[PDB]
From a paper:
Although members of the tumor necrosis factor (TNF)-alpha-induced protein 8 ([name]/TIPE/Oxi-α) family were originally described as regulators of tumorigenesis, inflammation and cell death, we previously discovered novel regulatory functions for these proteins in autophagy. In particular, [name] inhibits autophagy in an mTOR-dependent manner under oxidative stress conditions. In conclusion, our data demonstrate that mTnfaip8 is a novel phosphoglyceride binding protein with PE as the most preferred substrate. PE binding in the hydrophobic cavity allows it to form a ternary complex with Gαi3, mTnfaip8-PE-Gαi3, and to mediate insulin-induced anti-autophagy.
Residue numbers in the entry: 13 to 198
């Protein structure tokens, strides 16, 4: 007759639900060994600047956590019409941030702390608004912890100081960002 036939379906649902959420979630955004180089450099410049190994650890952990959750949401079509448009603006703004970070190193002395703070904060606000309907307070805190550290004016000025400890880090960071850009991952 009619065995419990539903189970072959949620299973079909479960089967592919997984198919788009977990794979891309980590197979694609962070396990990209180049993403890890960039994150490692972000760690080093933060540790170098804060003189605190565990405050630097927490910044990068917050960042990695945010990116993953963001990916999973996206791949799961949990975003509505307005969150997708926001996400698309976010991606454009991060692309522009990435190229501006590089250009401020590649073109001598064009570093402008206000341009970078404006772009970083625009990313920050985009992220808050994207996750507003789907994440809790902890995630908003992670977003602020990450962007508070990187948009810090004195942090930015030191990172682009060509005479100090940070010069070789900026060079490595830029190599990594450019690699992501060239692979079209950002
Ligand atoms: C030194 C001063 C500035 C330092 C920067 C501090 C770092 C904070 C800034 C930005 C956070 C980066 C988050 C990137 C999110 C990318 C988009 C995303 O998460 O969604 C996913 C994107 O999917 C991808 O495969 C591409 C992005 C995955 C890698 C991004 C995560 C890397 C983590 C470290 C990146 C650092 C960026 C540095 C920028 C200056 C899912 O959407 P999609 O449909 O697959 O992509 C559509 C395009 N076909």
């Amino acid at each position: 007759t009619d065995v419990f036939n539903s189970k072959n379906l949620a299973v079909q649902a479960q089967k592919k639900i997984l198919g788009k959420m977990v794979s891309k979630s980590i197979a694609t955004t962070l396990i990209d060994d180049t993403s890890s180089e960039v994150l490692d450099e972000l760690y080093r410049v933060t540790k170098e600047y804060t003189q605190n190994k565990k405050e630097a650890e927490r910044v990068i952990k917050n960042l990695i956590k945010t990116v993953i959750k963001l990916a999973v949401l996206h791949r799961n079509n949990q975003f509505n019409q307005d969150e997708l448009a926001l996400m698309e603006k976010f991606k454009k703004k991060v692309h522009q941030l990435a190229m501006t970070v590089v250009s401020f190193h590649q073109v001598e002395y064009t570093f402008d702390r206000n341009v970078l703070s404006r772009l970083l904060n625009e990313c920050r606000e985009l992220l808050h608004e994207i996750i507003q309907r789907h994440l809790t307070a902890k995630s908003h805190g992670r977003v602020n912890n990450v962007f508070d550290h990187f948009s810090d004016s004195d942090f930015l000025a030191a990172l682009y100081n060509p005479f100090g400890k940070f010069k070789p880090h900026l060079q490595k960071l830029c190599d990594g960002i450019n690699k992501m850009l060239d692979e079209e991952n950002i």
